[PDB]
Symmetry: D3
Subunit: 238 residues, 6 copies
């Protein structure tokens, strides 16, 4: 997993995400929700930024502890355990709290996501920002009901996707499928609950945040109806 | 009005029954009462209806039929805005907006404000009722579209529209083409909301969802429902 | 006399040849003869053609051209119904209905009845020939549609239609918009049938399918064929 | 199987619908399967004779029939309905649920089946079928591939070929399992449009008395994925 | 140039000028299908001499009118002729350009190759040929006939009825304007488009080679989803 | 495609008694029906293994001597002074060359190997009729009792390339992947390419039975001649 080629692997914007976050970090520490294997954390370390990466899954949090011990700048990465819904980190404050590539949408409810957003706000220093990267429903052009599609092709394996979309609950439930020459089959299930921009902004408001800027990606490209994703930056409200 | 699906939904009477069943003997407030498609059927059930409208002229066409209607004394025409809603200490058992009325306010802010005003005009246990297009069931294409609304013997009813899925706005022209060279255009604008969003909006306005149907006959509501009927109570 | 796809299919002559090859130098019957699009090309081949038409006035435009046509005495105009009638002891080698004529009868029953009447007017070995839209090939959307039929320098030919896949009916307006503000509307209705159904209908009427093509030039008929030409015999 | 991968969850509803039409007399189910509808019918005190051509299933019916409280009201019949002789036995209801009628790969075979059903009806008896509604089904021409259902450790997919002329569906229900397991379950259908189906019924000496979208009697329209149709003798 | 939003001409008149100017040297530039000078006049503001070819006289004259009333109007030189039927003598240009589907107004592959060749032969050394063309892939054009909404005004709608032949690669359409009050105006047009790979081969035959391709005159990156493309060609 | 006997008939009816050249002879899909028809076929390849299954079957085939197996590369072929009445490439063979340049070169080489009045024949997928979606797709190709045949592909409408895997899922867990790549061309483009290569289009059909070619045709069969004076 995460060693997959092309579109099967994670978006190749790790470096770009780091630069975007670093530019908002007052040379002070940042908090990544869903740090994963550190696709963004390490590039941030290469820039001299202290990264506290939260991950509810102790399993792969260790692989981070493992890549960090092998990474030239892995000490600037502080592995943290908790829930994006139950973040209790004391009097520690951050200049940036961010959740990349649909992390926020891993919380399977509007309530849970508002709560996560509030928790983020309360962990921000004055002038601090909350940054999220989310799929943009309008640009995704998601069909109603079930679909099946080709994600990526390798010489000896195909990457397919089977998914169920409920446009009411606004949930995506899918399997990433890997068919291998020789009969191998591996299934990687995942669930998302997405939100439309207008909704997401209202959610932020309830959580005491206000939108300050929105882009299509971390390189600050213009965001429009056809953008597959959006990068949103929030500040503490009035 | 116009025939078939060119005219207003034929659920005027069903709407009345649904609202009446929620009327604890006190009066109700219709936002965008129009010509009284629901107001008059409501009078036939012995319910007092205060109907708000900003369209001054169309409000006059209402008074005319009110004097000529057996139960016309039950319809109280009230000019103003779904925003200028300053009706004193008067309180209602039901405040309702039928057939996309709420979505005539071209903004999330304006709609939340309208919802809040509605709440503050409710008596204890009162309910706020809206009928809205359901985006999922509507299957709205991105950008511009053109379609056939209805057919008459001597005219066609067409629609040209622009949909912005970000702003969540519909801007359209109802077009009537008549044999002999007649063309009439009726422009309208909507700003819609998804159920999940609409509910959060209600929350901010101090309302909470109590029930949701596909129509006024209480049919199941699901992803394929073209419309929804939502009932809200005070938080 | 409308250009391109706006007017009737340009296969008038081909239709004649196809029918003639089935005519035992004996007379044929066209249902919905119209202005003789197939009738006159048929006379040029020396085939006696009886033609039925309900429309009294449009049948007159036929008589006019019959007197001015070299072989005009070969076209015999008949007033009556595409349905219930009485043509006496006259029998035909071919009875045919071109370009959706059969589908002008707005019901399965009426169409079976028409088919039966056709059978009973056939001499021994005679054939019943129909040209019908092929639903599979038409790829007809459910509900309402609007599309471009044809373009002229100074006019456009558009179509607004309603499709009910249950009743299997098409109800449309052919629309002509002219530079200068002119609007003309030409309404029509069809009730179509799928091949499998149509064949069962023929069976009930005492007919059996002998051959099916995509057109009058005997091109292979398949799922993508927009139309079909079917030939039936007595059973 | 789970979700949409399994058989429709309306076994209970199908039973009630049939029971309401059964003159407290015995009914005949064509394609009883594992008894998805038969047993619920037994729970309502209705005697169900179940015809089934699949031997792996007819015996499994017997297995559950012995272990079921009301199993004694289910009378299994192994074999092809077209060739089975039921004698002077008559039924109040003959029914075929979930596309059973469309398992006969021809219009002729289906009309014949309908006729056999009519002749086995007592006076005032009814023939009931549940069939996919082509208009609501929105079936694409040619080949298609789609997701049927998702499990934690398996996906349920479908590969199918549709011939809109022959009005046939030929498909494989595919199950991909974590670990490399692949199971294929082929099936074929020959469907009919409502207008056609009704004409077929007429030829078979039946006439339509009512049509619903499902066994709960919801209104049938162009968007209905399925239909439930009830026929009487002429 | 009067119609609003998506109905009017693309609002990139000025950007086009800037892009062409950056490629213009000493000798003038040649616009094929100059129209009302949507790009010509903005080009004069940058001090570039424009020779504008056109065959439509009910519009070439409307150009001269604005040229006399424009501060830098002496920089716009109106010409009557055909993109593939005019010898301009020994005059040479630093840039020859055809904006907004002009090249696709010639209803054939042959006529277009010929136009491209004519353009090449009018280029000074190091001169460039620039075209702006719809990109079929990004355009997502349906087969056969279509009808759609182009734009909305308060008192009128702008509609389009078209016929697309994917074999001949032709578009034949009517821009329709329906006005409150019963007014109907029809504006017919025809295009023959080319795919990028094809267009490049055409340029090769005409003795041109592709030097750069963008999505628009602001040099945005061209990809499969780009509705249009801006292509720059040099002599072989 | 089951039109081999038809591909043979089509080529044969253009060959007369002079020899023909098949590009991408493969396992002899087309060659033998031509041989069974008395036609001499020089077949070209570059992959030596797949050519042996032909040689193997050539010795075991009654008319196996009429099939002459050969080696080289389409764009650059050194076949000496040998000339052919027909040079043909069936089932998207031309589109196996992953570039417009390579394909034009192949077409030129084909022209130069034609005797006077000879013809170049190609069978190609028709983009308009294929209705190919942009980006990635997955579809059902065929069904067996114990296996399904699926397809996963990526389509780049700009490069006009198709990259796919033919997938075979078997009862019991077996999975077999057969990757392939194509670079296709639109008819108008293909014709211009032919012109550059000194060829001109003489006729175009939907298939080898000479059916009508139109926008909806999934494929086309095109015949080219050495361009007019």
């Amino acid at each position: 997993y995460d060693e997959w080629p092309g579109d099967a692997g994670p978006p190749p914007d790790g470096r770009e995400a780091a630069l975007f976050v670093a530019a908002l970090a007052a040379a002070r520490p940042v908090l990544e929700l869903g740090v994963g294997t550190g696709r963004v954390a390490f590039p941030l370390a290469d820039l001299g930024v202290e990264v506290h990466g939260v991950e509810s899954s102790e399993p792969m949090l260790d692989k981070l502890r493992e890549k960090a011990a092998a990474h030239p700048n892995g000490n600037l990465v502080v592995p943290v355990l908790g829930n994006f819904a139950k973040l209790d980190l004391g009097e520690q404050r951050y200049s940036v709290v961010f959740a990349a590539f649909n992390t926020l949408f891993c919380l399977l409810g509007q309530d849970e996501q508002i709560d996560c957003m509030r928790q983020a706000r309360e962990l921000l220093e004055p002038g601090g920002t909350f940054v999220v990267q989310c799929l943009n429903p309008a640009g995704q052009r998601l069909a109603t009901g079930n679909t099946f599609g080709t994600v990526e092709l390798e010489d000896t394996a195909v990457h397919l996707e089977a998914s169920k979309h409920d446009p009411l609950a606004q949930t995506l439930s899918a399997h990433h499928i890997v068919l291998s020459e020789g009969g191998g089959i591996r299934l990687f299930p995942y669930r998302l609950r997405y939100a439309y921009p207008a909704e997401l902004d209202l959610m932020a408001n309830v959580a005491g945040l206000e939108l300050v800027e929105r882009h299509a990606d971390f390189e600050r490209r213009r965001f429009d109806a056809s953008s597959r994703y959006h990068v949103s930056v929030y500040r503490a409200a009035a």
